[model samples]
Target chain A: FDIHKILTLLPHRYPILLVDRVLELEPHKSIKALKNVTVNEPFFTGHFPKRPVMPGVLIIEALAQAAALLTFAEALYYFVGIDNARFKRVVEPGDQLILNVTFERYIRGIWKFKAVAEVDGKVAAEAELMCTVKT
Target chain B: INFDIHKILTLLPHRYPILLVDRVLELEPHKSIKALKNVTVNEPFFTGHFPKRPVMPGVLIIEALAQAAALLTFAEATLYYFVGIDNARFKRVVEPGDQLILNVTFERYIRGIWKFKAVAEVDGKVAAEAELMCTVKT
Candidate 1:
């Protein structure tokens, strides 16, 4: 599913229609949506000023849309095992950031999705998110 | 700090930026809890979220209700964290200069899940309300 089809169901639009394309999606499972990055992207120019880094909330939206396409999930867990979660470099334009996310679980498990956004095989961002279900 | 349980600072595991309720006002084991927070311009978030127009963030009020739930169940060496928020709403924008009233009434408990009715108000005007489901740390 890509833009045209996504537009059919999502209540989103240009400027706010952040998901560029849905490369692949598995029902009630996962998705790998792609968002091409650019220095000219609407928000990047707004001035986090001087240095101009991609907004954490911006990439956060990236993870959200991609996650949304996956059964449009919700909900939390803890023990706060957020480690090796690093942003190695600035996710500025000129690189297409591939958003990759997957469902990870166990009964009464730490319901979490491990997500990664990378530019050209090198990680721009990655993290473990916990909060979820029981058998 | 010296000798206390009413000083919720000793019961909760949360601190800095996330600690929404400051004091517990009343409690009845296994039933309900009441608490209050001194909302003001002195905190950090109102500055970061909006400098021009500052209204206390809505989620923080829900969080205040959640913390009050802990005290209702407290009176524990155990931890408390919520899992579900149903019918949540914000009726008024909680801003600085108001004392947030947090009232969490214990409605029921099943297995490990504790359910409650949460309300946050300012001067008798309800600002937010919700039905929350929480589980104790096991």
Candidate 2:
């Protein structure tokens, strides 16, 4: 919803925050955001010598980070966990990760969410992530 | 410095179902080694991970290579365990029918802790790569 509220939920700083801004938020239903990619990322140097790829795992992390922001907004706003993340494509420099996240079920102390990261309108990565409410 | 299939199998102590590698193709002491992990549909994780689109779990791929590195260490000295791994990067997704080639090399060895650099490739393209730190118990 509000950018100021998002900054409070996530502790990551510039160059690593991943998510630039939240475009849409529907509490536990869904979340959408934009991740502007640039060449200054540290991983780009050694991830590849010739062709620089944004590294798939970090793309999933970016998506998860965005989901955490959404989940934080809906709940008491605390720690979140990630597991079973899968990346479908390689995200490269100059590419924007259009992240969309939705929860499968959140009941009885168990939470599950499905996340998808897109680039150029194509699905680049997607996975199932989970988090718990904290104090 | 060198240990063939017999030694590798003995070091891992893992048998069928989960034992991924058939054998090490080439061993070069601690510098690097070439090992083969055949991708087959019979794998247990495939059914649930995806039946139609079976993409190998990236962590398992890293683990496969990590196990290989452990074997490499075992070949030379005492037993070791993967204590922690960081700066891990999955380059490309490994799919079914893909033959995994683990090319792992030594990066550092300090104060009973070892660091390894590994890259998994298929069809001459990198599928996954990571820098791992391992510990041993003598």
Candidate 3:
């Protein structure tokens, strides 16, 4: 989906919105989204002054945002949980991030998924994610 | 609960939107610590995070807890990098005017890698909890 369609589904905007485009989507199964890490990010100004490295937490947040774009998540789901998160490489500006999320299980209101973030076909960060759908 | 914002500013090497901890309330070096960050409407991420009503971003909650972890491992001539996080969970949304209480404890230090047990609380209820790991830069 172009940004036009991406904006319709995701509420996160501007400074906070991490996903720029949705490359592929499979209803209730998996999705791929993209983020262009840029120099002008507000977090970059504070995350580091000289090095300007993107914070790992911010990368994790971007993965969480990608999970929200899944088709099963219709309601305003809380960015509730993550597990076994690992940051393998440093993400800097001028890099493009690809987030691949796969739905794993569903019990009650909890949805579990596997998410990995990649930069240049190499792992940047990976995590198991969960979010509770609000009724 | 003990100190002021200025001291926190001195201890943390972060600024603006990313400085999640506003002040430390109580601490003992290499032991355990408690801190505070006032969640306000002006928080930069709230512009998009909470949509209708502003909710503190959960990742930022974990980040605040890590800031407390950073303070616990403070050292001169050293740099610490956040390396991993395990078993993180969020309880409820934190709204504006909420006083976020950061409670963190030193879990262990081995091979220059520091592990911490942290919880982000509001009114003493669970907001987010995690096992945060950091390593010395050099």
Candidate 4:
């Protein structure tokens, strides 16, 4: 899916809109998305003037946003919780972030997803996230 | 104890747009910290992140909370790197002119990884909360 198709599903816009495109999707099951990191990212300006490492937290955000595309897909979803998140590698500018998310289950309005992010075929970060559809 | 901008700069290596935490309201050495984040209209994320409706991004909320945790750890550690976040939740919307009150507590430190519990609030309402882990970069 391109930016137009993605906009039809998510409410986020530029800068904050972390997911750039959808590579694959198994409706109600899983999704693989992409985000191209660049030197112009606003956070890089101050995160470190000397050493610019993409903040690990932002990596998680990209994962969560991809999961949002798969799970919510229509309306607004509220981030509820995250668990067992670990970062294995540092993501730098020019790295293409490949985000993979699998829908684990949904019960009592809460949706659980297993999210992983890779850069250049190496695991950059992974986390288990839970979110709920806003009423 | 209160930490002004200078003290905050000393604790964190962040500057400009990424230095999410602004002031220290309270600190309990090795235990907890209550810091403040003053959101303004001039924030860079607002420029392209929906000019029609500018609200603080949820991820930045987590970033601010993590920075609070970083401040609490600065007492014993020289530098820290965010490595994990668990049980993160965003409850309220953060906007320009809002004062975010961030609170964080030290959960544990094993080997080089430090665990923390964090919560961010705006106008006394809960905005976000998370369980975060960071590794001391000695």
Judged by lDDT, which candidate is best? 4
In model 4, which regions exceed 4 Å deviation? A1-135, B76-78
Model 4: which residue pairs collide? A82-B87, A82-B88
Instruction: Give each candidate's fraction of reference contacts reproduced.
Output: 0.00, 0.00, 0.04, 0.04
Q: Judged by lDDT relative to the true structure, which candidate is superior, 1 or 2?
A: 2
The local lDDT score (0 to 100) that residue B14 gets in candidate 1 is: 58
lDDT of 2 by residue, A5-111 (tens): 55567765443556656778898688997775533345654767444567887777777777777767667433355666667777754455788988678777667
Tens digits of per-residue lDDT, candidate 1, A1-135, equal 644455454454445445556777765567787775433334643644333356665665566556655634222112334445677667643345678878665346444567788777888788765543222
Q: Compute the DockQ of candidate 1.
A: 0.01
lDDT of 4 by residue, A24-44 (tens): 998889999887654345776
How close to the true structure is residue A131 of candidate 3, measured as C-alpha lDDT? 83
CA lDDT, candidate 4, residue B84: 94
Native contacts present in candidate 4, fraction: 0.04
Give the poorly placed runs of model 2, Cα more than 4 Å off.
Answer: A1-135, B1-5, B76-79
Write the number of the candidate with greater DockQ, choosing between 2 and 4: 4
Question: Candidate 2 residues B20-65, lDDT tens each?
Answer: 5545777777677787775533355755666344567898887788
* Candidates, ranked, TM-score: 4, 3, 1, 2
Give the C-alpha interface root-mean-square deviation per candidate. 19.2, 17.8, 12.4, 12.1
